[PDB]
């Protein structure tokens, strides 16, 4: 099990990848985003990281656009103090990859397809979710208009 580095400070993984404490400390990670409703905050009692949980299920009606600005402010906090951030969910990495792509669209000014081809090249196994794709497509259209 390994942690996929999208950007040098932004990391994508799953339930199994987030339980490796030695690797996360070797990568200078201090922030963790859990994009699930039921997974525990791993290594919480150890007091090593800053946690933010985005309660979401892997359904065809779940809303992830509501969590974008909340997750961006948490990423910019890690970027501002030089620490890395790990965002994860489950095996399909659908929910966590949706947020990673949305970040690349806003602060890197990439298009959705280019940001998807970028993430897919680093983590090849991404389960598709048409609901989240429609939210990224509408979010891409709001970035091109000013929302
Ligand atoms: C997000 C953009 C995806 C896309 C744009 S154009 C195209 C795709 C695509 N996506 C997928 S799975 C990606 C997702 O659904 C996540 C939200 C979990 C990242 N499989 C096959 C294709 C073939 C053609």
List the domain boundaries for the chain.
Answer: 1-147
Please count the residues of the chain.
147
Q: What angle do CA 106, 2, 29 make, to 5 degrees?
A: 55
* Burial classification of residue 109, based on how many CB atoms lie within 10 Å of its CB (0-12 exposed, 13-18 middle, 19 or more buried): exposed
Q: Is 143 in contact with 103 (CB distance < 8 Å)? A: no
Q: What resolution in angstrom units was achieved for this structure?
A: 3.1
Experimental method, per PDB record: X-ray
Q: In what order do the strands lie in the sheet with 4-7?
A: 4-7, 10-13, 84-88, 29-34, 50-53
Would you give the DSSP letter of residue 120?
H
For the record, the structure tokens of 133 come out as 């794709």
Query: How many CB atoms lie under 10 A from the CB of residue 73?
Result: 10
How many Å apart are CA 106 and CA 145, to the nearest integer?
12
Which of 6, 97, 99, 116 has most ligand 1 atoms within 8 Å of its beta carbon, as the pocket-test mutant? 116
Residues with CB under 6 A from ligand 1: 94, 97-98, 101, 112-113, 116, 126, 128-129, 132-133, 136
Which pairs from 76-82 meet CB under 8 Å and 24+ separation?
76/107, 77/31, 77/50, 78/9, 78/30, 78/31, 79/9, 81/30, 82/9, 82/28
């Amino acid at each position: 099990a390994e942690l996929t580095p999208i950007l040098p400070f932004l990391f994508l993984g799953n339930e199994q990848d987030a339980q490796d404490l030695d690797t996360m400390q070797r990568l200078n990670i201090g922030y963790v985003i859990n994009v699930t409703t039921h997974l525990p905050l791993y290594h919480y009692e150890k007091g090593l990281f800053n946690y933010k949980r985005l309660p979401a299920t892997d359904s065809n009606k779940q809303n992830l656009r509501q969590y974008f600005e909340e997750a961006f402010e948490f990423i910019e906090e890690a970027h501002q103090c030089g620490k890395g951030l790990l965002i994860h969910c489950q095996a399909g990495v659908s929910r966590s990859a949706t947020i990673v792509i949305a970040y690349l669209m806003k602060h890197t000014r990439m298009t959705m397809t280019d940001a998807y081809k970028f993430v897919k090249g680093k983590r090849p196994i991404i389960s598709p979710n048409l609901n989240f794709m429609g939210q990224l497509l509408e979010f891409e259209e709001d970035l091109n208009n000013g929302v």
